[PDB]
Design a protein around this ligand. Structure first.
Ligand SMILES: CCN(CCN(C)C)C(=O)c1cnn(-c2cc(C(=O)O)ccn2)c1-c1ccc(OC)cc1
Ligand SMILES: [Mn+2]
Length: 311
């Protein structure tokens, strides 16, 4: 039986008046969005930040992801030496990514329906006959090659028409990140992270450290498909995860288990866990709420930026 897409999470299209401050905006939509775990925010049509990373020198070593690593658990000869991590440029990764997807589906990359990639992704995760391997540029600090948003740190040129985006509250470098505590006063910081995706590259189910919010922006490229679970269902999801996990992993601390918590959304739904989905397209924000479990994968070559923030 083929994958059944979860219902769509809310999408908001604020006018310019409502698009003033992200914390005030998220506070207003919270009564609805906290009940779906994730939501999507489309900025006003005329809000188009330039892309401001150092593209000429952009280089990275993406992690290798084997889609069915879990279903193949329960030894193959020379396991552990399948594929080495190597260095790409932004350009050379994109050539590889588009070639992979167009080859895989036998059609131009921009013509593959989002629902077809979604169906194939979940089929491959559980398949013991097809061993698909992809790569994910997922460990890239904005401090390395700069943020995708313009930043007024004097390291890179900003045009007059771009200064607005350097100062915008929706620029992820201008989100509040400091958690309130007494230790924070007794002590004598965080920056955005970047994600360069290809078709089928993915993030497993997790919640943020300290149950933090996160905000996520897709700078350009093909969509990022998301699944989210409201915080009221967090303990339920955790129970399902431990019920259906391999016993070798069921007892592991959550912070380690989250490295390998791959689970088809339909399985959670059949166990009574509410799941919502969305395709985040270029120029759109996704916000995750405190203790909202989420997971997802990329439809093709794309570039995202994300940060944890505090309210
Ligand atoms: C689990 C918490 N965590 C550990 C932090 N510890 C080390 C301190 C994270 O790093 C983290 C937080 N969110 N998050 C994420 C990423 C995306 C995306 O890929 O678009 C979408 C939504 N969330 C990630 C992530 C990073 C890399 C990754 O590689 C495959 C997969 C997930
Ligand atoms: Mn996350």
């Amino acid at each position: 039986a083929e994958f059944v897409p979860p219902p769509e999470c809310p999408v908001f299209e604020p006018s310019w008046e409502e698009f003033t401050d992200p914390l005030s905006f998220i506070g207003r939509i919270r009564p609805l969005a906290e009940k779906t775990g994730i939501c999507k925010i489309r900025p006003p049509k005329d809000w188009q930040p330039p892309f401001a990373c150092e593209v000429k020198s952009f280089r990275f070593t993406p992690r290798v992801q084997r889609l069915n690593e879990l279903e193949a658990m329960t030894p193959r000869e020379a396991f552990g030496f399948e594929q080495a991590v190597r260095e790409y440029t932004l350009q050379s990764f994109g050539e590889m990514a588009d070639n992979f997807k167009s080859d895989y589906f036998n059609m131009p990359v921009h013509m593959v329906p989002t629902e077809l990639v979604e169906k194939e992704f979940w089929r491959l995760v559980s398949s013991i006959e097809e061993d698909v391997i992809v790569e994910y540029g997922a460990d890239i600090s904005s401090k390395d090659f700069g943020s995708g948003f313009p930043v007024k740190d004097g390291r890179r040129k900003i045009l007059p028409e771009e200064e607005e985006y350097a100062l915008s509250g929706w620029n992820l470098n201008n989100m509040p990140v400091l958690e309130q505590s007494v230790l924070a006063h007794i002590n004598v910081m965080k920056v955005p992270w970047l994600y360069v995706g290809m078709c089928f590259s993915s993030f497993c189910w997790h919640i943020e450290d300290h149950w933090s919010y996160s905000i996520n922006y897709l700078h350009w490229g093909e969509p990022k498909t998301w699944y989210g679970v409201p915080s009221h269902a967090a303990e339920q999801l955790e129970e399902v995860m431990r019920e259906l996990a391999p016993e070798l992993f069921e007892s592991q601390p959550d912070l380690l288990h989250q490295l390998v918590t791959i689970m088809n959304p339909n399985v959670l739904m059949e166990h009574g866990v509410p799941v919502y989905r969305t395709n985040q397209c270029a120029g759109e924000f996704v916000v995750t709420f405190p203790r909202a479990y989420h997971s997802g994968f990329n439809q093709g070559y794309n570039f995202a930026e994300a940060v944890n923030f505090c309210t």
